Amino acid sequence: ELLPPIAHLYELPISKEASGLVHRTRQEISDLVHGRDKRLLVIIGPCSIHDPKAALEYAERLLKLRKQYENELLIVMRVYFEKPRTTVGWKGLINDPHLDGTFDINFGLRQARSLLLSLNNMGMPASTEFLDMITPQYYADLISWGAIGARTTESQVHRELASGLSCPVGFKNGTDGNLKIAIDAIGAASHSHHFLSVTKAGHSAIVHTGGNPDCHVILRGGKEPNYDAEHVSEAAEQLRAAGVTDKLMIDCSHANSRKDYTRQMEVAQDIAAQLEQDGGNIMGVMVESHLVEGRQDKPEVYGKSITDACIGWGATEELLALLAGANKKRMAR
Amino acid sequence: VKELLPPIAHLYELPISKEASGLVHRTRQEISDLVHGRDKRLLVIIGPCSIHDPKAALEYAERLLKLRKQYENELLIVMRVYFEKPRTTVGWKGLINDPHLDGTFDINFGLRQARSLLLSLNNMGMPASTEFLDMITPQYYADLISWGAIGARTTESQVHRELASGLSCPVGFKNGTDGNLKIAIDAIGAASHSHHFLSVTKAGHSAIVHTGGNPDCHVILRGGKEPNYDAEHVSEAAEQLRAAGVTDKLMIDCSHANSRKDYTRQMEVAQDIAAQLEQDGGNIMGVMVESHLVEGRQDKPEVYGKSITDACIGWGATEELLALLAGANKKRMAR
Amino acid sequence: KELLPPIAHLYELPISKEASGLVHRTRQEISDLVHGRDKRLLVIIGPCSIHDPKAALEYAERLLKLRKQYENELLIVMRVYFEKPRTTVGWKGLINDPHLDGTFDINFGLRQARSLLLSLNNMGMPASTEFLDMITPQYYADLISWGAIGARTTESQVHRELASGLSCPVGFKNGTDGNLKIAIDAIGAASHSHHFLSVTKAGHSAIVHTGGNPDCHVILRGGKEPNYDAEHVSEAAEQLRAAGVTDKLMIDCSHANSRKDYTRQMEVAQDIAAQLEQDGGNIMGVMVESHLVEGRQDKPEVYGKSITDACIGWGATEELLALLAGANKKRMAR
Amino acid sequence: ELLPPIAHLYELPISKEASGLVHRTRQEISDLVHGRDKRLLVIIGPCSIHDPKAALEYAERLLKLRKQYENELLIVMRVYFEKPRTTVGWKGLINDPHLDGTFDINFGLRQARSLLLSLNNMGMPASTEFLDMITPQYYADLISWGAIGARTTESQVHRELASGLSCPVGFKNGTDGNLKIAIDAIGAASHSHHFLSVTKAGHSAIVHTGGNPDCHVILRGGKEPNYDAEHVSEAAEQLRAAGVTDKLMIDCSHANSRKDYTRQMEVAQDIAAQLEQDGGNIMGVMVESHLVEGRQDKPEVYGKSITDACIGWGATEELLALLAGANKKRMARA
Numbered sequence A: 001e002l003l004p005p006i007a008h009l010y011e012l013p014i015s016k017e018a019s020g021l022v023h024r025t026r027q028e029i030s031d032l033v034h035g036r037d038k039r040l041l042v043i044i045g046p047c048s049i050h051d052p053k054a055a056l057e058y059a060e061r062l063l064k065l066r067k068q069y070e071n072e073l074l075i076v077m078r079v080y081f082e083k084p085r086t087t088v089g090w091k092g093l094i095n096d097p098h099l100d101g102t103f104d105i106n107f108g109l110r111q112a113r114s115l116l117l118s119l120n121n122m123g124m125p126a127s128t129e130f131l132d133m134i135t136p137q138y139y140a141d142l143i144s145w146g147a148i149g150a151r152t153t154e155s156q157v158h159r160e161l162a163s164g165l166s167c168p169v170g171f172k173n174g175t176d177g178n179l180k181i182a183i184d185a186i187g188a189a190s191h192s193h194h195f196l197s198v199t200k201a202g203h204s205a206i207v208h209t210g211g212n213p214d215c216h217v218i219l220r221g222g223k224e225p226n227y228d229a230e231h232v233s234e235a236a237e238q239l240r241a242a243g244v245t246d247k248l249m250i251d252c253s254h255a256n257s258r259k260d261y262t263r264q265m266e267v268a269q270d271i272a273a274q275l276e277q278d279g280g281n282i283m284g285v286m287v288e289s290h291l292v293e294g295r296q297d298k299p300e301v302y303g304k305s306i307t308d309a310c311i312g313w314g315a316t317e318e319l320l321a322l323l324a325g326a327n328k329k330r331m332a333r
Numbered sequence B: 001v002k003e004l005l006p007p008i009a010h011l012y013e014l015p016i017s018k019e020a021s022g023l024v025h026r027t028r029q030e031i032s033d034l035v036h037g038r039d040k041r042l043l044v045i046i047g048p049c050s051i052h053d054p055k056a057a058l059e060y061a062e063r064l065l066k067l068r069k070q071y072e073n074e075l076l077i078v079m080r081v082y083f084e085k086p087r088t089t090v091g092w093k094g095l096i097n098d099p100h101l102d103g104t105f106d107i108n109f110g111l112r113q114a115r116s117l118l119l120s121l122n123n124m125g126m127p128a129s130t131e132f133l134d135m136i137t138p139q140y141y142a143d144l145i146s147w148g149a150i151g152a153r154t155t156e157s158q159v160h161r162e163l164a165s166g167l168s169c170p171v172g173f174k175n176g177t178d179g180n181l182k183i184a185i186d187a188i189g190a191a192s193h194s195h196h197f198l199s200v201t202k203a204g205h206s207a208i209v210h211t212g213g214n215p216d217c218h219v220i221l222r223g224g225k226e227p228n229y230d231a232e233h234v235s236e237a238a239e240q241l242r243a244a245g246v247t248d249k250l251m252i253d254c255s256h257a258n259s260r261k262d263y264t265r266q267m268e269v270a271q272d273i274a275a276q277l278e279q280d281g282g283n284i285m286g287v288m289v290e291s292h293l294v295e296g297r298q299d300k301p302e303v304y305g306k307s308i309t310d311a312c313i314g315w316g317a318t319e320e321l322l323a324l325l326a327g328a329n330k331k332r333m334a335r
Numbered sequence C: 001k002e003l004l005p006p007i008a009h010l011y012e013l014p015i016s017k018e019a020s021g022l023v024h025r026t027r028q029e030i031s032d033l034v035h036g037r038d039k040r041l042l043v044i045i046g047p048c049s050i051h052d053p054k055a056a057l058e059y060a061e062r063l064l065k066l067r068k069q070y071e072n073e074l075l076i077v078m079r080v081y082f083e084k085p086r087t088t089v090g091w092k093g094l095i096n097d098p099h100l101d102g103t104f105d106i107n108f109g110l111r112q113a114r115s116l117l118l119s120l121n122n123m124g125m126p127a128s129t130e131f132l133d134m135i136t137p138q139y140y141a142d143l144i145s146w147g148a149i150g151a152r153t154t155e156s157q158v159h160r161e162l163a164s165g166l167s168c169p170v171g172f173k174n175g176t177d178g179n180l181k182i183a184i185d186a187i188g189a190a191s192h193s194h195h196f197l198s199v200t201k202a203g204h205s206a207i208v209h210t211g212g213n214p215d216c217h218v219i220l221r222g223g224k225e226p227n228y229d230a231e232h233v234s235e236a237a238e239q240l241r242a243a244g245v246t247d248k249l250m251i252d253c254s255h256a257n258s259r260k261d262y263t264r265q266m267e268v269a270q271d272i273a274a275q276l277e278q279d280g281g282n283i284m285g286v287m288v289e290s291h292l293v294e295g296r297q298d299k300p301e302v303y304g305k306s307i308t309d310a311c312i313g314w315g316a317t318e319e320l321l322a323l324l325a326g327a328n329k330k331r332m333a334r
Numbered sequence D: 001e002l003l004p005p006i007a008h009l010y011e012l013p014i015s016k017e018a019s020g021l022v023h024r025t026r027q028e029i030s031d032l033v034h035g036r037d038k039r040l041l042v043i044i045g046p047c048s049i050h051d052p053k054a055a056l057e058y059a060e061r062l063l064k065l066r067k068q069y070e071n072e073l074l075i076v077m078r079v080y081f082e083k084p085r086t087t088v089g090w091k092g093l094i095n096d097p098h099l100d101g102t103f104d105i106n107f108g109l110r111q112a113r114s115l116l117l118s119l120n121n122m123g124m125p126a127s128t129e130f131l132d133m134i135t136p137q138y139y140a141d142l143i144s145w146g147a148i149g150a151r152t153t154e155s156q157v158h159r160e161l162a163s164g165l166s167c168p169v170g171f172k173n174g175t176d177g178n179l180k181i182a183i184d185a186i187g188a189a190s191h192s193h194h195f196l197s198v199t200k201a202g203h204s205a206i207v208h209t210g211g212n213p214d215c216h217v218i219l220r221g222g223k224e225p226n227y228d229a230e231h232v233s234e235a236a237e238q239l240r241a242a243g244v245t246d247k248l249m250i251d252c253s254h255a256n257s258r259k260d261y262t263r264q265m266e267v268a269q270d271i272a273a274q275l276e277q278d279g280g281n282i283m284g285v286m287v288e289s290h291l292v293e294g295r296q297d298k299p300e301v302y303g304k305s306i307t308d309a310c311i312g313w314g315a316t317e318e319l320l321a322l323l324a325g326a327n328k329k330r331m332a333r334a
């Protein structure tokens, strides 16, 4: 029997501190999306959260780099709770918290909220992919930035959802490299919509959204990678042609790394080079990172991904120093 | 946030009848048989791109009904009764979302009107098909639907695969808007399995549902960068379907990216399909045709029985096309 | 079983401009009687219980002409009782068992009740009922111009709570053995704001915060002995004033005041008429159990005849209203 | 914005131990009601719970007597969360937990469940008055015995509620002494009913109850006390005449004590004397007891009632020893 959002909000109300961090971080990101600040947003963390203990440890380490680079980078943790599978598979912590096919969703949602509250309370803002239609009411108030995945960008119900989120939202290009669907998606999500959704009390209702002003595109690769300068420039021209923001984000992972975690660094280096030469259209990057590098099918090793392979903590330090140094130069112009 | 009546309210005013229930049951089975190769009739999903007027749709049904009966040994005719439309950016999302066509978004009326029409259609002997786009609306009218599509833009979406996994009707997954067929094959795999996810009950309250899987899914070739209707394309698709361990019987959409911005090309496509059915065409179990009383399209709903969404062929062309397919499939069935 | 929420019935049967206006008006007009601003006599009259809408519509049609005829002396409002409190067990009314066969088709019952109430208000006839259940009122309350809380539930806090949140005037009946203080206590209670659990138009439980009902009053319905007469009214008015609440009250001609003998309602009416002639300043209303055809029956075989408490018939009803109208015309002249 | 029962059941699931205690205690009480065991049920504790700390402390002390006297008495704590007022007033911990007019009902219901779980976990079963229609779904699973109050015994919605409780239920005679309404009530509650109620998920629904076979009456005084032998005998005769159990419970407090806390001991002494002589129709008693005696308007003194005045802990030890000694003799005859 599903507990409604209000049950979880009662046990874990948002705090003054978390509320302020979310509010502030959303604004700060808005400023990047609309070209009012030239810091580089960095969405970085695990492909998926499967352990909260490890995620809290990861956050603790990342928090120090968030503070150290705060003049060059705006660091936000990937705290992904919902995973889109190619066919079937584990859909994430909310759907299957115990990782055993028991689908204890009430526990999952509790655990997700708790972790998010803790993260915000320690000073680390959170980001996630919004995949399910009904789960967001549980934890959305604790999210500073949202992704709509490559597999759902073209979907109208996801564009509808985005249109009503209070956080900035990144739409990824399609799994074969279609960028126009993400540009279309900003157009869609920036408008007001009417559709069916569920309330904080667990009942279905008609909602009227005001539109999300702060959407942007994410280059995640397709058949071929789309990260490089030619690709960014091409994208920016298409964005301007559609009358939407020409500031975009580049995913170092996934189709841009050809599903090879050791290539995220190459992509980061290419981005760094663009930031040095010009790179005026770049406002963010995305990196799949964890305590320990690689991936594993069963959750045997602590702080190691059970979804997409991540770079480890050492490589993570390198990468952030690389980007911070490069962006400091861009901001000096 | 505005008041929404739960499904049970609409089920109370418009309960399914013995007859509609039996037609739905029977038609789902009949389609299952096509999907799994037990019957060589050709499913034909045919009707408007979208329903915007119930009067016209009832009239269209009246005429189509006679052909459904006339061709029942060769074709299994089912009407397109599409209530939910996926836009490229923004636009009118269909009768449920905006029944009045004026931006009033009177969804309670929409859902009532949709159920009423569907009940009337089934009652007169015409089965109905629609695209399932929204997650929460299906509980309102799903019991009146004999076949469902998941659109090109949502086939890759996991929530749509989940929804499909719990529908009691056969379901067609369309290839992607640029021609990706693997996403539809992946989608059958997904939807055929059991899933656990959040959904809303007949009473309007969110809940965890545990679906049993949908064994009757299949692929639809709707074009992409290049059309995928012809024999080479069908054969390539059947090989990929067999490789994935799912049914190699598929459906071909004559409309959309296969007709490539001419409604009248649907006839060319139908002719090509007819030729395949004559030569061999063993992998084809269905086709899809965008048809209305009057041909073409219009931005405003000024002309009766003319589409306000994608352009359709008219009634005359519709008669030609069905006779063509019937004649051709009679031959395939004789071998 | 799957209960439809109030909004489902409100969608099919929205209140009309006309019904809405009649309800609003009639509640005000009654308020005026309760607080002594108008000397017309409220008359709550109709069947003990509604078991057939056809008959009730026919009854209303006839009563409507007397309501118009006597509108300067009487304010006539129909008893349209959907919920019945049993001594032990029994048929609890149309909402609970509409088919009268123990099928308990409550969704139908509530639909039928609302439909009837809408039709009644639409034709010009205001409606009254006893509010017994906690959750049913959300379905039809908007169509009710006056409400009773029964003798068996007046002392109950959940009924006082419910009353506190009704937008219509409410009569509290004295207890089944004649206790009047519980009804006076009940006005105190219901006049204040309350917080308690209730169900929304959407069918979900919720905390409600009521504003209080300023239009409550007492009803004398008999006990071990009848309490209708002048000595009893005077005694009651003194107790009401002592508690700081309205000393205008209503007298039930039926039930314990008639000693469960329908032919005595007329005696009681005559005694009330005499009081209205002599003085009767504390009386603002009466209650009469009336139908098309007099008496009662266990099974619903005869049309327009009660299956609950025995009622007077249409002829006697015409007599009684003329009696009260004539008597009250005199009181108003003073 | 009201949380549904499932939210509280998720945070505070019933334990194996509490579940077993409830199950067992309900059976043991059933046995008393139907004359299969001659122990004396004792419902004892505060008039109302306003502080959980004090209630847990009270329980701790009572638990030792429950164990000491377990062969003669079956002791169960009064843990009353809902209070019926004469007019207006504080309605109990659930309605206003903070005691300040903030009506924080979500907190109240949480606190009530938590306290009840703790009580059952330590070995102390709980009893309460069921007043509200929607609150029971929150805490009912933790209750071993239920009362329907003097003010609501005649009410059909309370008889309906009772008909679906899994615990034995005592119906009190009316505030002026009417016993027949309680006998009628057992008749009613023992039958199946159909009515509207709210689910564990917080949505309204139609419920079909199976009937409660374990109801009995409670003598709690009226205009005059009804505790004595003549009154018991007279009640038993009426009970037998109605075909329901002639084993009853006697409240030492309220009308019987004449609203005087000191008086309860007298009543207990009279009951003890009946148990010695014969007292075959008595299965239970009710006592209003707390740490400290008397009452107070504001919650200034710890463990002292803010509702009806209670006897203190000392007097409580005296009373239980009195009843235990007396009932040991009754049980020896057999």
Ligand SMILES: C[C@H](OP(=O)(O)O)C(=O)O
Pocket: A047, A084, A129, A148, A149, A150, A151, A172, A220, A254, A308
């Ligand atoms: C899988 C997902 O990215 P996508 O494949 O949607 O680009 C993710 O962010 O890990």
Ligand SMILES: C[C@H](OP(=O)(O)O)C(=O)O
Pocket: B049, B086, B131, B150, B151, B152, B153, B174, B222, B256, B310
């Ligand atoms: C729009 C939809 O088709 P799709 O573009 O998903 O093939 C339809 O059938 O009208």
Ligand SMILES: C[C@H](OP(=O)(O)O)C(=O)O
Pocket: C048, C049, C081, C084, C085, C130, C149, C150, C151, C152, C173, C221, C255, C309
């Ligand atoms: C039963 C009820 O009267 P009461 O007994 O509450 O005075 C009625 O008016 O039918």
Ligand SMILES: C[C@H](OP(=O)(O)O)C(=O)O
Pocket: D047, D084, D129, D148, D149, D150, D151, D172, D220, D254, D255, D308
């Ligand atoms: C007040 C209530 O009992 P009653 O007055 O119903 O006998 C109680 O037990 O506190």
Ligand SMILES: [Mn+2]
Pocket: A047, A048, A288, A307, A308
């Ligand atoms: Mn990933």
Ligand SMILES: [Mn+2]
Pocket: B049, B050, B255, B256, B290, B309, B310
């Ligand atoms: Mn179309």
Ligand SMILES: [Mn+2]
Pocket: C048, C255, C289, C308, C309
């Ligand atoms: Mn009556």
Ligand SMILES: [Mn+2]
Pocket: D047, D048, D253, D254, D288, D307, D308
């Ligand atoms: Mn008390």
